[PDB]
Amino acid sequence: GEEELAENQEFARELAN
């Protein structure tokens, strides 16, 4: 929902995993 819209950028931080 409107959430994935933001996760869109967090992707760059997800790599931190």
From Swiss-Prot:
Q: Which residues form a coiled coil?
A: none
Question: In this UniProt entry, which cysteines form S-S bonds?
Answer: none
The listed outcome for E14K is:
No change in activity
- Kindly list the positions annotated as binding a divalent metal cation: E3, E7, E10, E14
Outcome (variant: E7K)? No change in activity
Instruction: Give all 4-carboxyglutamate modified positions.
Output: E3, E4, E7, E10, E14
Site (Important for activity (Pro and hydroxyPro)) found at Q9
PTM annotation (Asparagine amide): residues: N17
**Positions of modified residues (4-hydroxyproline):** Q9
Where in the chain is the site Important for selectivity?
Answer: N8
Q: What else is known?
A: The mature peptide does not contain cysteine residue.
Q: Name the family the entry cites.
A: Belongs to the conotoxin B superfamily.
Q: Which protein, by its recorded name, is this?
A: Conantokin Rl-B
Q: Which residues of the full protein are shown?
A: 79 to 96 of 96
